[PDB]
Design a protein around this ligand. Structure first.
Ligand SMILES: O=c1ccn([C@H]2C[C@H](O)[C@@H](COP(=O)(O)NP(=O)(O)OP(=O)(O)O)O2)c(=O)[nH]1
Ligand SMILES: O=c1ccn([C@H]2C[C@H](O)[C@@H](COP(=O)(O)NP(=O)(O)OP(=O)(O)O)O2)c(=O)[nH]1
Ligand SMILES: O=c1ccn([C@H]2C[C@H](O)[C@@H](COP(=O)(O)NP(=O)(O)OP(=O)(O)O)O2)c(=O)[nH]1
Ligand SMILES: [Mg+2]
Ligand SMILES: [Mg+2]
Ligand SMILES: [Mg+2]
Lengths: 199, 199, 199
């Protein structure tokens, strides 16, 4: 049971789903188009040891970022070359965390899957790493995990990067995501790293 | 609300969902198995600059194609070696775009997720890059974005590559995908590159 | 139509969905959290020729495994270095097959999508390769296809790796997965390689 344009528009109209900011032009037949924020995270450790707290760097782009596939083997020279040639603000290799501009709130009877736009998929750019499931009760922005798999990709601030596909629950959740004490990522105001060391 | 074998068969029987060509043997408990077309696209530019129109090459296989992981570092020699050893028609590295044989039409009250078969997943071969969501109202073949993540994979023309998982909308869409002026990929007769420069 | 915590708990309570072993603490708003088994598979051939039967190796971890991105270029020296530094049992590069601890049974009117936890997604670790769709009627453990896309990741035996998102069918399947003669992966007791050579 998937929400259509009118269901989305009506659930928003009714304040039952929150989407801040909202643009009705981004409502498609059965999904809401979300946009890429200007804040990104890259991690800094040799390995991800999930028992530990992770070191990372935050960047804020002005207009654009070049995302290279892992093992592109970026030298300082290559970075400067790409910045000069393509006028991008940052060049990164492998995984970068991003965020939607949109802050969302889901009722205990709606769920969402975040999925990338096919336009991005068609250039081998992914925006979640087998994740994108948004629980009933969730409140926050959505953290994107971005990897290029063919060639470097230029992504622009505020571009449409993916889509929320909402679905009705059979029965509502007893305790929605944001009501749980265990929840790591509620009230997510920006791009947020992994907190798995809290398990 | 996911369609089962009988729902799929009945929606097809009723002409409410179109699947051309259709083979009832490919209907599973809750998905329709789709097959790999003979047309592929590979892109040709240094970076994907999504503000621009992209350069690419089209190939048509006779029987098979070898898909190597990115940074396999294919020399002309290695290519010739694989063609001789495995009798494949093309050898490619990183991302290749493919297409289903099947042309489909969805009513304004059905949606689909394209997903790969676990048999392919189990050899680390993907056939969409965080995409695969098919809108209510969509008409066309389905464009596959294919990447190998462990070792090179031989894919054969007309093999079963993935599956459509159909789902009911709560209310139908006011305007289905193919009725929208904005829609980039309606009436898709083959493998189609990214048209994101049209945003 | 997605099952919530109470739907899951009630379907389990009613024996209509089987989950062995079951921990009610792992029931979230709208998904059941699954755990990583100690058995893994790595394949051994130059290419995956899907017309053929595949060679592979089985490992059983005691506590942990380091999963490196493909083309990390692991020497014996690097392996020994990581084992000494991080006290992991195995170091692997590219794709490794894993399994859930949980054996599950689905009725002919329930379907599931396996998806990774965002905590793992946020470190660019995937646990299925465009797959994760569990058919109505399926009986078995779930085979995970695991790839790291940024930096090596330490995964621990019995950790929570992903989640089952169950959904109601519109009508039940005439023949569920485990009732079909064609089915490759029914009664799956561990991690299982690709049987696509049986098509
Ligand atoms: O992986 C996919 C995904 C979608 N499609 C088809 C079905 C879908 O209805 C259509 C567009 O899907 P998206 O909306 O996810 N792509 P995008 O947003 O770039 O195109 P548009 O601006 O036309 O919506 O393309 C494919 O062929 N392959
Ligand atoms: O990622 C997955 C996906 C599915 N499965 C299980 C559940 C599902 O019912 C079963 C088969 O799924 P697919 O139909 O997607 N695989 P395939 O088409 O290759 O096998 P078959 O020919 O048996 O349908 O394997 C896993 O263990 N891991
Ligand atoms: O890709 C995603 C997925 C989820 N999310 C949000 C929505 C979801 O409700 C929340 C947690 O999702 P998961 O349960 O899949 N992550 P995890 O299990 O690691 O966190 P927790 O222990 O809090 O459930 O994070 C993102 O921002 N990006
Ligand atoms: Mg779209
Ligand atoms: Mg199948
Ligand atoms: Mg969770």
């Amino acid at each position: 049971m998937i929400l259509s344009d009118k269901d989305i528009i009506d659930y928003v109209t009714s304040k039952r789903i929150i989407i801040k900011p909202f643009n009705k032009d981004f409502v498609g037949p059965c999904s809401y188009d979300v946009t890429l924020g200007d804040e990104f995270i890259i991690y800094d450790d040799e390995v991800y040891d999930l028992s530990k707290e992770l070191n990372y760097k935050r960047i804020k782009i002005k207009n654009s970022i070049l995302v290279c596939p892992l093992n592109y083997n970026l030298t300082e020279e290559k970075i400067n070359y790409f910045k000069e040639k393509y006028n991008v603000d940052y060049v990164v290799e492998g995984g970068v965390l991003g965020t939607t501009n949109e802050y969302i709130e889901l009722p205990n009877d709606i769920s969402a899957q975040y999925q990338g736009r096919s336009s991005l998929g068609r250039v081998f750019l992914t925006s979640h790493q087998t994740a994108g499931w948004i629980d009933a009760g969730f409140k926050g922005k959505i953290t994107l995990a971005i990897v290029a798999f063919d060639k470097p990709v230029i992504l622009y601030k505020n571009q449409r990067i993916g889509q929320l596909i909402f679905s009705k629950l059979l029965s509502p959740a007893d305790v929605g995501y944001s009501e749980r004490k265990t929840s790591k990522y509620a009230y997510q105001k920006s791009v947020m790293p992994s907190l798995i060391h809290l398990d």
